[PDB]
Design an enzyme around this catalytic site. Sequence first.
Site, short mmCIF file in Angstrom:
data_model
loop_
_atom_site.label_atom_id
_atom_site.label_comp_id
_atom_site.label_asym_id
_atom_site.label_seq_id
_atom_site.Cartn_x
_atom_site.Cartn_y
_atom_site.Cartn_z
N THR A 12 0.81 -1.21 0.00
CA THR A 12 0.00 0.00 0.00
C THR A 12 0.84 1.27 0.00
O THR A 12 0.28 2.37 -0.08
CB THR A 12 -0.94 0.02 1.23
OG1 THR A 12 -0.19 -0.21 2.43
CG2 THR A 12 -2.01 -1.06 1.10
N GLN A 14 4.14 4.03 -0.97
CA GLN A 14 4.52 4.80 -2.16
C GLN A 14 5.11 3.91 -3.27
O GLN A 14 4.63 3.90 -4.41
CB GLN A 14 5.51 5.88 -1.73
CG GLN A 14 6.15 6.57 -2.87
CD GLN A 14 7.09 7.69 -2.46
OE1 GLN A 14 7.88 7.58 -1.51
NE2 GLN A 14 7.03 8.78 -3.21
N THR A 15 6.15 3.14 -2.93
CA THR A 15 6.77 2.27 -3.93
C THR A 15 5.97 0.98 -4.08
O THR A 15 5.89 0.43 -5.18
CB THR A 15 8.22 1.97 -3.51
OG1 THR A 15 8.89 3.20 -3.21
CG2 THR A 15 8.99 1.23 -4.63
N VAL A 55 2.88 -6.99 10.02
CA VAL A 55 4.19 -7.62 9.88
C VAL A 55 4.84 -7.89 11.24
O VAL A 55 5.78 -8.68 11.31
CB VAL A 55 5.11 -6.74 9.00
CG1 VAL A 55 5.79 -5.65 9.83
CG2 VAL A 55 6.15 -7.61 8.23
N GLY A 76 7.97 0.49 5.47
CA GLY A 76 8.44 1.80 5.90
C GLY A 76 7.43 2.42 6.83
O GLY A 76 6.39 1.84 7.13
N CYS A 109 14.12 -3.47 0.58
CA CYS A 109 14.51 -2.08 0.44
C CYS A 109 14.89 -1.50 1.80
O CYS A 109 14.07 -1.50 2.74
CB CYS A 109 13.35 -1.29 -0.17
SG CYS A 109 13.74 0.46 -0.52
N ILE A 154 13.54 8.78 -3.25
CA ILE A 154 12.52 8.19 -4.10
C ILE A 154 11.62 9.32 -4.61
O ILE A 154 11.02 10.06 -3.82
CB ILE A 154 11.71 7.12 -3.34
CG1 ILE A 154 12.61 5.97 -2.90
CG2 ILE A 154 10.60 6.55 -4.21
CD1 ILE A 154 11.88 4.99 -1.95
N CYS A 188 14.94 -8.04 -9.91
CA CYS A 188 15.78 -8.86 -9.04
C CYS A 188 15.23 -10.26 -8.86
O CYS A 188 15.98 -11.17 -8.47
CB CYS A 188 15.93 -8.18 -7.68
SG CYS A 188 17.05 -6.76 -7.77
N1 LIG Z 1 11.57 8.73 1.36
C1 LIG Z 1 12.72 8.45 0.50
O1 LIG Z 1 13.02 9.23 -0.35
C2 LIG Z 1 13.50 7.18 0.73
C3 LIG Z 1 14.75 7.04 0.24
C4 LIG Z 1 15.43 5.87 0.49
C5 LIG Z 1 14.82 4.84 1.23
N2 LIG Z 1 13.56 4.98 1.73
C6 LIG Z 1 12.96 3.87 2.48
O2 LIG Z 1 12.29 2.97 1.35
C7 LIG Z 1 11.38 2.20 1.95
C8 LIG Z 1 10.08 2.29 1.14
O3 LIG Z 1 9.69 3.67 1.15
P1 LIG Z 1 8.17 4.02 0.63
O4 LIG Z 1 8.03 5.51 0.59
O5 LIG Z 1 7.88 3.32 -0.65
O6 LIG Z 1 7.21 3.39 1.77
P2 LIG Z 1 5.95 4.03 2.57
O7 LIG Z 1 5.18 4.95 1.61
O8 LIG Z 1 6.48 4.57 3.90
O9 LIG Z 1 5.06 2.66 2.78
C9 LIG Z 1 5.35 1.86 3.92
C10 LIG Z 1 4.65 0.51 3.72
O10 LIG Z 1 4.92 -0.29 4.78
C11 LIG Z 1 3.56 -0.75 5.37
N3 LIG Z 1 3.73 -0.97 6.77
C12 LIG Z 1 4.17 -0.16 7.73
N4 LIG Z 1 4.07 -0.78 8.92
C13 LIG Z 1 3.53 -2.00 8.68
C14 LIG Z 1 3.22 -2.98 9.58
N5 LIG Z 1 3.38 -3.03 10.97
N6 LIG Z 1 2.69 -4.13 9.14
C15 LIG Z 1 2.43 -4.29 7.81
N7 LIG Z 1 2.76 -3.32 6.88
C16 LIG Z 1 3.31 -2.15 7.35
C17 LIG Z 1 2.78 0.35 5.12
O11 LIG Z 1 1.36 -0.06 5.28
P3 LIG Z 1 0.12 1.01 5.71
O12 LIG Z 1 -0.62 1.37 4.44
O13 LIG Z 1 -0.76 0.24 6.64
O14 LIG Z 1 0.75 2.23 6.34
C18 LIG Z 1 3.11 0.71 3.66
O15 LIG Z 1 2.55 -0.15 2.76
C19 LIG Z 1 11.18 2.78 3.36
O16 LIG Z 1 11.75 1.95 4.30
C20 LIG Z 1 11.92 4.14 3.27
O17 LIG Z 1 12.37 4.54 4.61
C21 LIG Z 1 12.89 6.14 1.48
#
Ligand SMILES: NC(=O)c1ccc[n+]([C@@H]2O[C@H](COP(=O)([O-])OP(=O)(O)OC[C@H]3O[C@@H](n4cnc5c(N)ncnc54)[C@H](OP(=O)(O)O)[C@@H]3O)[C@@H](O)[C@H]2O)c1
Lengths: 206, 206
Positions: A12, A14-15, A55, A76, A109, A154, A188
């Site tokens: 659900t 962003q990525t 999770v 995340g 990731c 991202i 991958c």
């Molecule tokens: N922001 C950046 O530019 C950047 C750069 C490098 C790396 N990153 C890292 O890349 C990774 C992916 O980033 P993103 O922006 O695509 O992710 P995101 O938008 O923060 O999405 C997080 C995902 O993890 C799920 N989640 C969180 N807690 C959970 C739990 N207890 N149980 C089950 N699912 C759970 C969330 O579900 P819900 O819908 O329920 O919330 C959501 O689907 C992250 O770890 C981020 O820190 C980010």
Amino acid sequence: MAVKKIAIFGATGQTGLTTLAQAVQAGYEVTVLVRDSSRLPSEGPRPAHVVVGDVLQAADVDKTVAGQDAVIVLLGTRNDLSPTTVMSEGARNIVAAMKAHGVDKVVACTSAFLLWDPTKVPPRLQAVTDDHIRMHKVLRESGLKYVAVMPPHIGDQPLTGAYTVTLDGRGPSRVISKHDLGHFMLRCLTTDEYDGHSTYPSHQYQ
Amino acid sequence: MAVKKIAIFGATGQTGLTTLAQAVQAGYEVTVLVRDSSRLPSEGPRPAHVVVGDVLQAADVDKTVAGQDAVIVLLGTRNDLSPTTVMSEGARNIVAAMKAHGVDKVVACTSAFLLWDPTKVPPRLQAVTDDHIRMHKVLRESGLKYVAVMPPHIGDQPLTGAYTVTLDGRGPSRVISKHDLGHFMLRCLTTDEYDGHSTYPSHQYQ
Ligand SMILES: NC(=O)c1ccc[n+]([C@@H]2O[C@H](COP(=O)([O-])OP(=O)(O)OC[C@H]3O[C@@H](n4cnc5c(N)ncnc54)[C@H](OP(=O)(O)O)[C@@H]3O)[C@@H](O)[C@H]2O)c1
Ligand SMILES: NC(=O)c1ccc[n+]([C@@H]2O[C@H](COP(=O)([O-])OP(=O)(O)OC[C@H]3O[C@@H](n4cnc5c(N)ncnc54)[C@H](OP(=O)(O)O)[C@@H]3O)[C@@H](O)[C@H]2O)c1
């Protein structure tokens, strides 16, 4: 399909949303774990199987990992920068379920800051980065076929499939689009060349 | 001041195992308290004395501490995510035994969370940190010569004996290899200079 059934954690997000969309289009049979309050949007692509849970619960992770060919992890905290262990504890559960069910391939990731000089990690990001560090250690020590995806910022730029993939070091650009990052996560699945490596995808959008 | 015989508590854990191996290679006569002797390696450096028992059992601790010159504490309860008193109750048993047998030197591991603001602690790590604080108070109030070792993230980098030790504060890096951490626990046996201080070992790993 050699790899056909995959679990996506974080679908659900962003990525996760565009990785799911690309996976379904590519013919994957996708299982997602979604928290009860945050299901997939009604209008988006539909996965093959939905597990509602968390999770942090081994039981829910077990249900999601059972019967899969491979696992993609896009967990995340949606830009909440507070101290957390949800990613590393979730990875602990994913590792245990993968070992119990005979799944070996995990593409997970964390972030490019694990390839940075730690003294240059922005302090505002240190708490989340600390858990990325914990998560990467869990996955590296598991002995599974682990692709460590460590992206820079991202962004919202297009899917190109034309990004650079830098092995075990920082790459030449400081951004990857969420669509290209999801494209790489899926890439991958069909090669062993990145197993046991850290990978930094980056691109210049032009 | 000359330390030849040591007890190690937590010898089967991540840091314990390499501390034990380094201690045996260096010539220490090592006694360990283990709940399960099969968690000790069958090969390579092995302790001189194995007591099978539980740090929660005062008689098991007393038998481990008897005759020692110093005690190393590398206990942990990583799975406990809610209030737990294993480490502090263990430390109480260790202190009583050290007093009963005239052992004056203890080097014990808690965590660098005890040097940072309490809001830095992830919610699920608050219980372990609270008990680290309880263990630290037990040891400080004992009157024994006590070196408090408060490491940041424990990594798996090779031994490098070149780490920095910061006194009563935190240093520039936020990682210590488990091997370097063990090396520092043993170094604390060869000097008085850290007695009554908090110590923060850290390094930049090339
Ligand atoms: N922001 C950046 O530019 C950047 C750069 C490098 C790396 N990153 C890292 O890349 C990774 C992916 O980033 P993103 O922006 O695509 O992710 P995101 O938008 O923060 O999405 C997080 C995902 O993890 C799920 N989640 C969180 N807690 C959970 C739990 N207890 N149980 C089950 N699912 C759970 C969330 O579900 P819900 O819908 O329920 O919330 C959501 O689907 C992250 O770890 C981020 O820190 C980010
Ligand atoms: N991981 C990090 O990055 C980090 C960072 C800062 C501080 N710390 C703290 O550093 C300390 C050492 O960490 P670690 O990862 O090396 O420890 P660990 O791998 O979790 O090992 C814990 C040790 O304590 C033993 N133990 C637990 N309960 C016991 C009991 N009732 N009786 C006898 N022995 C018992 C365990 O024995 P068994 O083998 O029988 O279970 C094991 O040998 C911990 O207190 C940790 O919280 C860790």
